[PDB]
Design a protein around this ligand. Structure first.
Ligand SMILES: Nc1nc2c(ncn2[C@@H]2O[C@H](COP(=O)(O)OP(=O)(O)O)[C@@H](O)[C@H]2O)c(=O)[nH]1
Ligand SMILES: [Mg+2]
Lengths: 90, 18, 393
């Protein structure tokens, strides 16, 4: 197995707040398995808001890092749509 | 709120002090 | 058999440091101490006073087996700092419907702090006072009675002229029942106008999510504060004011943060609504990023539709105290102004007479005309309170 992790920043002033954050993330995860068949599981959690960690676990190093990047790409793009500011931390 | 009133409470206190 | 209800009244505990305020509170509530403790209050209808008054569903403490009658639930305000307490009531950050002035029969009356505390209660109009002569156990009755006369002598000619005096021994928990009887008699719960627009001062804000919490389980930020007026309910749409600091290029401004109340809790008890009284814990939908580590401390909360002035500049009809917890206030000066639970620096533009103008570094929400503000100035590197006033809209 291989684990690719990413570190991000997430925040919103939306009225639904935390519920809006969950909506963006699940929408970014939808059907990720159908795109990368080698994935076993993914976990997105807070490590002290606004910081969250995205851990992608699978059997193919390349597919895992591609999935990680697609998830992150989906998060930023979809977040801009729902007024949820998401960016990658260096 | 009278002295006599205060005093009675004061006696009650010392009467329970070990 | 007693019901689980929110505290309905706030009682401040003041007096010079080391006189027994925290022990007293602990002797009343059984809780050790902004310090804050709550306690139910009942009365054994069969028994005799003061013993008939209790803090728990039992009349054995006075020789009876009847279920005592529930009266109400009260909360106490007790701080470890002398100046924090002064800032609390002088700014109105914490609602006080009454107060207990603690006096140690041990030392001479009145001490320096005990003195400032009395002028404060007068300033904020807290009429319902009970003076508690404490630590009587370490003095002779002759001594006890002497100070009594000194106290009565001090209250003579003042609003506190007829204020009752109760001698107790917080340490040995003696005459605590007489004090309870006193509280029920002199510090009655005030009438509350529940039609006023809901206003809550934010004193704490937390992110209760433990690290590692899956995103779907993320909880909204929690707000801790004191409801000043009105009735808050679960599911109400509310907003945080001034709100979110926003920078658009050269313009900086503050935007109300809209959210919703997901839960209401007093201690370890939850409710569907909250009226004034006690300290409340409010769950919301807010991004935890905004509430973590008391980041909203100093804000206020109200219904999303409330019309509330948020101003950078304010006018304050003021008064200077006789001592520093006292030179006049002059223009071009930078003072610290405490409005509610917020504290903001600001420079004085004008100074005409019993009135001033202030350019605030951060704007404040004035949910009503003539709200109280504490005025402090930096002395020798530390900010000290030197006056108080009313903000005029
Ligand atoms: N003899 C005596 N000591 C007391 C009593 N109440 C409190 N104390 C003691 O006096 C000190 C100050 O009490 P504390 O509760 O911390 O009061 P605070 O400093 O006013 O908030 C502590 O050392 C207590 O043990 C009392 O009724 N009698
Ligand atoms: Mg203390």
């Amino acid at each position: 197995k291989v684990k690719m992790s990413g570190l991000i920043t997430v925040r919103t002033n939306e009225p639904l707040g935390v519920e809006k954050i969950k909506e963006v993330i699940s929408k970014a995860l939808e059907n990720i398995e159908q795109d990368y068949e080698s994935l076993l599981n993914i976990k997105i959690y807070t490590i002290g808001a606004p910081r969250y960690r995205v851990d992608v676990v699978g059997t193919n190093p390349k597919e895992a890092s591609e999935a990680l990047n697609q998830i992150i790409s989906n998060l930023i793009k979809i977040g801009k749509e729902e007024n949820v500011d998401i960016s990658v931390v260096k | 709120s009278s002295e006599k009133e205060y005093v009675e409470m004061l006696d009650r206190l010392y009467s329970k002090l070990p | 058999a007693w019901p689980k209800v929110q505290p309905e009244v706030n009682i401040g505990v003041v007096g010079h440091v080391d006189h027994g305020k925290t022990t007293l509170v602990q002797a009343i509530t059984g809780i050790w101490t902004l310090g804050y403790a709550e306690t139910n209050i009942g009365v054994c209808e069969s028994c005799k006073k003061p013993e008939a008054y209790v803090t728990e569903p039992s009349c054995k403490s006075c020789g009876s087996d009847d279920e005592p009658k529930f009266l109400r639930r009260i909360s106490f305000i007790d701080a470890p700092g002398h100046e924090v307490l002064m800032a609390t009531m002088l700014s109105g950050a914490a609602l006080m419907d009454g107060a207990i002035l603690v006096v140690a029969a041990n030392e001479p009356f009145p001490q320096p702090q005990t003195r400032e505390h009395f002028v404060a209660l007068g300033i904020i109009g807290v009429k319902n006072l009970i003076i508690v002569q404490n630590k009587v156990d370490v003095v002779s009755k002759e001594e006890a009675l002497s100070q009594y006369r000194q106290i009565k002598q001090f209250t003579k000619g003042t609003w506190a002229e007829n204020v009752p005096i109760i001698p107790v021994s917080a340490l040995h928990k003696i005459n605590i029942d007489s004090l309870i009887e006193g509280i029920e008699e002199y510090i009655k719960t005030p009438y509350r106008d529940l039609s006023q627009k809901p206003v809550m001062l934010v004193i704490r804000s937390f992110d209760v999510n433990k690290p590692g919490t899956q995103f779907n389980e993320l909880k909204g930020g929690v707000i801790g504060g004191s409801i000043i007026q009105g009735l808050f309910k679960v599911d109400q749409e509310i907003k945080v004011l001034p709100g979110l600091r926003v920078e658009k290029q050269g313009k900086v401004s503050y935007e109300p943060i809209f959210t919703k109340i997901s839960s209401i809790r007093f201690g370890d008890e939850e409710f569907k609504e909250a009226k004034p009284g006690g300290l409340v814990a409010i769950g919301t939908y807010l991004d935890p990023s905004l509430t973590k580590a008391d980041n909203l401390l100093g804000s206020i909360i109200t219904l999303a539709d409330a019309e509330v002035p948020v101003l950078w500049n304010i006018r304050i009809k003021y008064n200077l105290l006789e001592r520093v917890v006292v030179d006049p206030i002059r223009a071009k000066e930078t003072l610290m102004l405490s409005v509610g639970s917020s504290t903001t620096l600001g420079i004085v533009t004008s100074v005409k007479k019993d009135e001033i103008e202030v350019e605030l570094r951060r704007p404040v929400a004035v949910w009503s005309n003539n709200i109280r503000t504490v005025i402090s100035r930096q002395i020798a590197g530390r900010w000290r309170m030197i006056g108080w006033g009313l903000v005029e809209i």
